Amino acid sequence: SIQAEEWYFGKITRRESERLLLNAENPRGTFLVRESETTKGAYCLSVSDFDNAKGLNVKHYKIRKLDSGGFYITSRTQFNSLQQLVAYYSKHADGLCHRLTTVCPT
Ligand SMILES: *C(=O)c1cc(C)cc(C=O)c1OP(=O)(O)O
């Protein structure tokens, strides 16, 4: 049950996700998962980042879900659940702008 997850914001827009994440109190890695505005069945992982170049900014990654059961951002690294995916990206930055650190505050 993904909607039970505190990091799951469900049906919110891309603009809303960025409004929530662009708060100055948010450290790098602040994140949320929401439905994709356009892609049916896909989820979107929105993550805050920060650097002296760009300052505070937001990145979006598409989370695909296979009828065959797997969840993934890259087909090479798949998970049995969205929860396991989130747990894995909280420790490995891999190709993400930062590892997932803190759930986005409302
Ligand atoms: C998430 O589904 C998503 C992923 C990327 C790489 C980009 C964007 C847009 O900024 C996404 O949001 P979406 O609402 O699906 O367009």
CSV table of N, CA and C and ligand atoms in Angstrom, one decimal:
chain,number,residue,atom,x,y,z
A,1,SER,N,0.8,-1.2,0.0
A,1,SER,CA,0.0,0.0,0.0
A,1,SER,C,0.9,1.3,0.0
A,2,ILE,N,1.0,1.8,-1.2
A,2,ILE,CA,1.8,3.1,-1.4
A,2,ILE,C,1.2,4.3,-0.8
A,3,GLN,N,-0.1,4.4,-0.9
A,3,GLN,CA,-0.8,5.6,-0.4
A,3,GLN,C,-0.7,5.6,1.2
A,4,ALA,N,-0.2,4.6,1.8
A,4,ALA,CA,-0.1,4.5,3.2
A,4,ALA,C,1.2,5.2,3.6
A,5,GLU,N,2.1,5.3,2.6
A,5,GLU,CA,3.4,5.9,2.8
A,5,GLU,C,3.4,7.4,3.0
A,6,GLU,N,4.1,7.8,4.0
A,6,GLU,CA,4.2,9.2,4.3
A,6,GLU,C,4.9,10.0,3.1
A,7,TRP,N,5.8,9.4,2.3
A,7,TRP,CA,6.5,10.1,1.2
A,7,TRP,C,5.6,10.0,0.0
A,8,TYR,N,4.5,9.4,0.0
A,8,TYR,CA,3.6,9.3,-1.2
A,8,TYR,C,2.7,10.5,-1.1
A,9,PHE,N,2.8,11.4,-2.1
A,9,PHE,CA,1.9,12.6,-2.1
A,9,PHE,C,0.8,12.4,-3.1
A,10,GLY,N,0.7,11.2,-3.8
A,10,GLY,CA,-0.4,11.0,-4.7
A,10,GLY,C,-0.5,11.9,-5.9
A,11,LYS,N,-1.7,12.3,-6.1
A,11,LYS,CA,-2.0,13.1,-7.2
A,11,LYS,C,-1.7,14.6,-7.0
A,12,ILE,N,-0.5,15.0,-7.1
A,12,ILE,CA,-0.2,16.5,-7.0
A,12,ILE,C,0.6,16.8,-8.3
A,13,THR,N,0.6,18.0,-8.8
A,13,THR,CA,1.2,18.4,-10.0
A,13,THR,C,2.7,18.5,-9.8
A,14,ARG,N,3.4,18.7,-10.9
A,14,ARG,CA,4.8,18.9,-11.0
A,14,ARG,C,5.2,20.3,-10.3
A,15,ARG,N,4.3,21.3,-10.6
A,15,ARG,CA,4.5,22.6,-10.1
A,15,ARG,C,4.3,22.6,-8.6
A,16,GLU,N,3.4,21.8,-8.1
A,16,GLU,CA,3.1,21.7,-6.6
A,16,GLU,C,4.3,21.0,-6.0
A,17,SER,N,4.8,19.9,-6.6
A,17,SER,CA,6.0,19.2,-6.0
A,17,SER,C,7.2,20.2,-5.9
A,18,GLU,N,7.4,21.0,-6.9
A,18,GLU,CA,8.5,21.9,-6.8
A,18,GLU,C,8.2,23.0,-5.8
A,19,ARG,N,7.0,23.4,-5.6
A,19,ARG,CA,6.7,24.4,-4.6
A,19,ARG,C,7.1,23.9,-3.2
A,20,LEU,N,6.7,22.6,-3.0
A,20,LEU,CA,7.0,22.0,-1.7
A,20,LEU,C,8.5,21.8,-1.4
A,21,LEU,N,9.2,21.3,-2.5
A,21,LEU,CA,10.6,21.1,-2.4
A,21,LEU,C,11.6,22.3,-2.3
A,22,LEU,N,11.2,23.4,-2.9
A,22,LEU,CA,12.0,24.6,-3.0
A,22,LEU,C,12.0,25.4,-1.7
A,23,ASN,N,11.8,24.8,-0.6
A,23,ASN,CA,11.7,25.5,0.6
A,23,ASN,C,13.2,25.5,1.1
A,24,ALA,N,13.7,26.7,1.5
A,24,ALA,CA,15.1,26.9,2.0
A,24,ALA,C,15.5,26.0,3.2
A,25,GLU,N,14.6,25.5,4.0
A,25,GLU,CA,14.9,24.7,5.1
A,25,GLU,C,15.1,23.2,4.6
A,26,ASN,N,14.8,22.9,3.4
A,26,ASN,CA,15.0,21.5,2.9
A,26,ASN,C,16.4,21.2,2.5
A,27,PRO,N,17.0,20.2,3.1
A,27,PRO,CA,18.4,19.8,2.8
A,27,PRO,C,18.4,19.0,1.5
A,28,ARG,N,19.6,18.8,0.9
A,28,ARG,CA,19.7,18.0,-0.3
A,28,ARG,C,19.1,16.6,0.0
A,29,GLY,N,18.4,16.0,-1.0
A,29,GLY,CA,17.8,14.7,-0.8
A,29,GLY,C,16.4,14.7,-0.3
A,30,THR,N,15.8,15.9,0.0
A,30,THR,CA,14.4,15.9,0.4
A,30,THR,C,13.6,15.4,-0.8
A,31,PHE,N,12.6,14.6,-0.5
A,31,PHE,CA,11.9,14.0,-1.6
A,31,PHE,C,10.4,13.6,-1.3
A,32,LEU,N,9.8,13.3,-2.4
A,32,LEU,CA,8.4,12.8,-2.4
A,32,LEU,C,8.2,12.0,-3.7
A,33,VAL,N,7.1,11.2,-3.6
A,33,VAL,CA,6.8,10.3,-4.8
A,33,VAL,C,5.3,10.7,-5.1
A,34,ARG,N,5.0,10.9,-6.3
A,34,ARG,CA,3.7,11.3,-6.7
A,34,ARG,C,3.3,10.7,-8.0
A,35,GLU,N,2.1,10.8,-8.5
A,35,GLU,CA,1.7,10.2,-9.7
A,35,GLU,C,2.3,11.1,-10.8
A,36,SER,N,2.5,10.5,-12.0
A,36,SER,CA,3.1,11.2,-13.1
A,36,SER,C,1.8,12.0,-13.8
A,37,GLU,N,2.1,13.2,-14.2
A,37,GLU,CA,1.0,14.1,-14.8
A,37,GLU,C,0.5,13.5,-16.1
A,38,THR,N,1.4,13.0,-16.9
A,38,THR,CA,1.3,12.4,-18.2
A,38,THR,C,1.3,10.9,-18.4
A,39,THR,N,2.2,10.2,-17.8
A,39,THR,CA,2.4,8.8,-18.0
A,39,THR,C,1.5,7.9,-17.1
A,40,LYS,N,0.6,7.2,-17.7
A,40,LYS,CA,-0.3,6.3,-17.0
A,40,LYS,C,0.6,5.2,-16.3
A,41,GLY,N,0.3,4.9,-15.1
A,41,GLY,CA,1.0,3.8,-14.4
A,41,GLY,C,2.4,4.2,-13.9
A,42,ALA,N,2.9,5.3,-14.3
A,42,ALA,CA,4.2,5.7,-13.8
A,42,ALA,C,4.1,6.6,-12.6
A,43,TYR,N,5.1,6.6,-11.8
A,43,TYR,CA,5.2,7.4,-10.6
A,43,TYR,C,6.3,8.3,-10.9
A,44,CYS,N,6.5,9.4,-10.1
A,44,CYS,CA,7.5,10.4,-10.3
A,44,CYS,C,8.1,10.6,-8.9
A,45,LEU,N,9.4,10.6,-8.9
A,45,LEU,CA,10.2,10.8,-7.7
A,45,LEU,C,10.8,12.2,-7.8
A,46,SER,N,10.4,13.2,-7.0
A,46,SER,CA,10.9,14.5,-7.1
A,46,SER,C,11.8,14.7,-5.9
A,47,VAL,N,13.0,15.2,-6.2
A,47,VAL,CA,14.1,15.3,-5.2
A,47,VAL,C,14.7,16.7,-5.2
A,48,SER,N,15.0,17.2,-4.0
A,48,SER,CA,15.6,18.6,-4.0
A,48,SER,C,17.1,18.4,-4.0
A,49,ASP,N,17.8,19.4,-4.6
A,49,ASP,CA,19.2,19.4,-4.6
A,49,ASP,C,19.7,20.8,-4.3
A,50,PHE,N,21.0,21.0,-4.2
A,50,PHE,CA,21.5,22.3,-3.9
A,50,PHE,C,23.0,22.3,-4.3
A,51,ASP,N,23.4,23.4,-4.8
A,51,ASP,CA,24.8,23.6,-5.1
A,51,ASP,C,25.0,25.1,-5.3
A,52,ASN,N,26.3,25.6,-5.3
A,52,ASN,CA,26.5,27.0,-5.5
A,52,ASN,C,26.2,27.5,-6.9
A,53,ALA,N,26.3,26.6,-7.8
A,53,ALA,CA,26.0,26.9,-9.2
A,53,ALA,C,24.5,27.2,-9.4
A,54,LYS,N,23.7,26.3,-9.1
A,54,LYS,CA,22.2,26.3,-9.2
A,54,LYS,C,21.4,26.7,-8.0
A,55,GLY,N,22.1,26.7,-6.8
A,55,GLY,CA,21.4,27.0,-5.6
A,55,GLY,C,20.5,25.8,-5.4
A,56,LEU,N,19.3,26.1,-4.7
A,56,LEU,CA,18.3,25.0,-4.4
A,56,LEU,C,17.5,24.7,-5.7
A,57,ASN,N,17.3,23.5,-6.0
A,57,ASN,CA,16.6,23.1,-7.2
A,57,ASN,C,16.0,21.8,-7.1
A,58,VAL,N,15.1,21.4,-8.1
A,58,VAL,CA,14.4,20.1,-8.0
A,58,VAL,C,14.6,19.2,-9.3
A,59,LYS,N,14.8,17.9,-9.0
A,59,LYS,CA,15.0,16.9,-10.1
A,59,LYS,C,13.8,15.9,-10.0
A,60,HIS,N,13.4,15.4,-11.2
A,60,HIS,CA,12.3,14.5,-11.3
A,60,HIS,C,12.8,13.2,-12.0
A,61,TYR,N,12.4,12.1,-11.4
A,61,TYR,CA,12.8,10.8,-12.0
A,61,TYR,C,11.5,10.0,-12.2
A,62,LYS,N,11.4,9.3,-13.3
A,62,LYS,CA,10.3,8.5,-13.6
A,62,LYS,C,10.4,7.1,-13.0
A,63,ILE,N,9.5,6.6,-12.2
A,63,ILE,CA,9.5,5.3,-11.7
A,63,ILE,C,8.5,4.4,-12.5
A,64,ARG,N,9.1,3.5,-13.2
A,64,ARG,CA,8.2,2.6,-14.0
A,64,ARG,C,7.8,1.3,-13.2
A,65,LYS,N,6.6,0.9,-13.5
A,65,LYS,CA,6.1,-0.3,-12.8
A,65,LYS,C,5.7,-1.3,-13.9
A,66,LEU,N,6.4,-2.5,-13.8
A,66,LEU,CA,6.2,-3.6,-14.8
A,66,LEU,C,4.9,-4.4,-14.4
A,67,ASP,N,4.2,-4.9,-15.4
A,67,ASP,CA,3.1,-5.8,-15.1
A,67,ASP,C,3.7,-7.0,-14.5
A,68,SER,N,5.0,-7.3,-15.0
A,68,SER,CA,5.8,-8.4,-14.5
A,68,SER,C,6.3,-8.2,-13.0
A,69,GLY,N,5.7,-7.2,-12.4
A,69,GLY,CA,6.0,-6.9,-11.0
A,69,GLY,C,7.1,-6.0,-10.5
A,70,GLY,N,8.1,-5.7,-11.3
A,70,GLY,CA,9.1,-4.8,-10.9
A,70,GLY,C,8.9,-3.3,-10.9
A,71,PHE,N,9.6,-2.6,-10.0
A,71,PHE,CA,9.6,-1.1,-10.0
A,71,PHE,C,11.0,-0.7,-10.3
A,72,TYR,N,11.2,0.4,-11.1
A,72,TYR,CA,12.5,0.8,-11.4
A,72,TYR,C,12.6,2.2,-12.0
A,73,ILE,N,13.7,2.9,-11.9
A,73,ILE,CA,14.0,4.2,-12.5
A,73,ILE,C,14.8,3.7,-13.7
A,74,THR,N,15.9,2.9,-13.5
A,74,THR,CA,16.6,2.2,-14.6
A,74,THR,C,16.3,0.7,-14.7
A,75,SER,N,16.0,0.2,-15.9
A,75,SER,CA,15.7,-1.2,-16.0
A,75,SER,C,16.8,-2.2,-15.4
A,76,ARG,N,18.0,-1.7,-15.3
A,76,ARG,CA,19.1,-2.5,-14.8
A,76,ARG,C,19.0,-2.7,-13.3
A,77,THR,N,18.3,-1.8,-12.6
A,77,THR,CA,18.2,-1.9,-11.1
A,77,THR,C,16.7,-1.9,-10.7
A,78,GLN,N,16.1,-3.1,-10.6
A,78,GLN,CA,14.7,-3.3,-10.3
A,78,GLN,C,14.4,-3.7,-8.9
A,79,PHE,N,13.2,-3.4,-8.4
A,79,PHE,CA,12.8,-3.7,-7.1
A,79,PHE,C,11.4,-4.4,-7.1
A,80,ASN,N,11.1,-5.2,-6.0
A,80,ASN,CA,9.8,-5.9,-5.9
A,80,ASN,C,8.7,-4.9,-5.4
A,81,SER,N,9.2,-3.7,-4.8
A,81,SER,CA,8.2,-2.8,-4.4
A,81,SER,C,8.7,-1.4,-4.4
A,82,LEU,N,7.8,-0.4,-4.5
A,82,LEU,CA,8.2,1.0,-4.5
A,82,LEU,C,9.0,1.3,-3.2
A,83,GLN,N,8.5,0.7,-2.1
A,83,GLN,CA,9.2,0.9,-0.8
A,83,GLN,C,10.6,0.4,-0.8
A,84,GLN,N,10.9,-0.7,-1.4
A,84,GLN,CA,12.3,-1.2,-1.5
A,84,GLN,C,13.1,-0.3,-2.4
A,85,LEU,N,12.5,0.3,-3.4
A,85,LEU,CA,13.2,1.2,-4.3
A,85,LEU,C,13.6,2.5,-3.5
A,86,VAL,N,12.6,3.0,-2.7
A,86,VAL,CA,12.9,4.2,-2.0
A,86,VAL,C,14.0,3.8,-1.0
A,87,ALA,N,13.9,2.7,-0.3
A,87,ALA,CA,15.0,2.3,0.7
A,87,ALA,C,16.3,2.2,0.0
A,88,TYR,N,16.4,1.6,-1.2
A,88,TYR,CA,17.7,1.5,-1.9
A,88,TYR,C,18.3,2.8,-2.3
A,89,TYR,N,17.4,3.8,-2.7
A,89,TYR,CA,17.9,5.1,-3.1
A,89,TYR,C,18.2,6.1,-1.9
A,90,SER,N,17.9,5.6,-0.7
A,90,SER,CA,18.2,6.4,0.5
A,90,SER,C,19.6,6.1,0.9
A,91,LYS,N,20.2,5.0,0.3
A,91,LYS,CA,21.7,4.7,0.6
A,91,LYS,C,22.6,4.9,-0.6
A,92,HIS,N,22.1,4.8,-1.9
A,92,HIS,CA,22.9,4.9,-3.0
A,92,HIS,C,22.4,6.1,-3.8
A,93,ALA,N,23.3,7.0,-4.2
A,93,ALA,CA,22.9,8.1,-5.0
A,93,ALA,C,22.8,7.6,-6.5
A,94,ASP,N,23.7,6.7,-6.9
A,94,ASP,CA,23.8,6.2,-8.2
A,94,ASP,C,23.6,7.3,-9.2
A,95,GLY,N,22.6,7.3,-10.1
A,95,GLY,CA,22.5,8.4,-11.0
A,95,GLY,C,21.7,9.6,-10.6
A,96,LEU,N,21.1,9.5,-9.3
A,96,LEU,CA,20.3,10.6,-8.8
A,96,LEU,C,21.1,11.8,-8.4
A,97,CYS,N,20.4,12.9,-8.2
A,97,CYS,CA,21.1,14.1,-7.9
A,97,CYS,C,21.7,14.0,-6.4
A,98,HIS,N,21.1,13.1,-5.7
A,98,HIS,CA,21.5,12.9,-4.3
A,98,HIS,C,20.7,11.7,-3.7
A,99,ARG,N,21.2,11.1,-2.7
A,99,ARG,CA,20.5,10.0,-2.1
A,99,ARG,C,19.3,10.6,-1.4
A,100,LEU,N,18.2,9.8,-1.3
A,100,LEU,CA,17.0,10.3,-0.6
A,100,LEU,C,17.3,10.4,0.9
A,101,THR,N,17.1,11.6,1.5
A,101,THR,CA,17.4,11.8,2.9
A,101,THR,C,16.1,12.1,3.7
A,102,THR,N,15.4,13.1,3.4
A,102,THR,CA,14.2,13.4,4.3
A,102,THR,C,12.9,13.6,3.5
A,103,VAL,N,11.8,13.1,4.0
A,103,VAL,CA,10.5,13.2,3.3
A,103,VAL,C,10.1,14.7,3.3
A,104,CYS,N,9.6,15.1,2.2
A,104,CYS,CA,9.2,16.5,2.0
A,104,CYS,C,8.2,16.9,3.0
A,105,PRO,N,8.5,18.0,3.7
A,105,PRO,CA,7.5,18.5,4.7
A,105,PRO,C,6.4,19.2,3.9
A,106,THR,N,5.2,19.1,4.4
A,106,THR,CA,4.0,19.8,3.9
A,106,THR,C,4.0,21.3,4.1
B,1,LIG,C1,7.9,12.0,-13.2
B,1,LIG,O1,6.9,11.2,-13.7
B,1,LIG,C2,8.7,12.9,-14.0
B,1,LIG,C3,10.1,12.6,-14.3
B,1,LIG,C4,10.9,13.4,-15.0
B,1,LIG,C5,12.3,13.0,-15.4
B,1,LIG,C6,10.4,14.7,-15.4
B,1,LIG,C7,9.1,15.1,-15.0
B,1,LIG,C8,8.8,16.5,-15.3
B,1,LIG,O2,9.4,17.5,-14.9
B,1,LIG,C9,8.2,14.2,-14.4
B,1,LIG,O3,7.0,14.7,-14.0
B,1,LIG,P1,5.7,14.5,-14.8
B,1,LIG,O4,4.6,15.1,-13.9
B,1,LIG,O5,5.4,13.0,-14.9
B,1,LIG,O6,5.7,15.2,-16.0
